[PDB]
Amino acid sequence: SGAIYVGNYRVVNRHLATHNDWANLVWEDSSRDLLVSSTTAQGCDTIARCDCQTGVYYCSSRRKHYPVSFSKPSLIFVEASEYYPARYQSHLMLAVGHSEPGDCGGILRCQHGVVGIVSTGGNGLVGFADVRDLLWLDE
Ligand X SMILES: NC(=O)[C@H]1CCC(=O)N(Cc2ccccc2-c2cccnc2)C1
> Which one-letter amino acid corresponds to residue 12?
V
- Residue 120 CB, shortest distance to ligand X, in Å, is 5
Q: Which does 2 bind (CB under 5 to 8 A by kind): ligand X, Zn ion, none?
A: none
Of 18, 22, 25, 50, the residue at the interface with Zn ion (CB under 5 A) is 50
25 binds Zn ion (CB under 5 A): no
- Chain Cα centroid distance, residue 18: 16
What are the CA-CA distances from residue 23 to residues 28, 62, 77, 100, 110 (Å)?
12, 33, 30, 28, 32
Mark 22-41 with x for binding to ligand X (rule: CB under 6 A) and - for no binding: -----------x--------
Q: What sign for the dihedral angle of Cα 48, 70, 73, 130?
A: negative
List residues near ligand X by CB under 6 A. 15, 33, 78-79, 81, 83-84, 89, 99-101, 103-104, 119-122
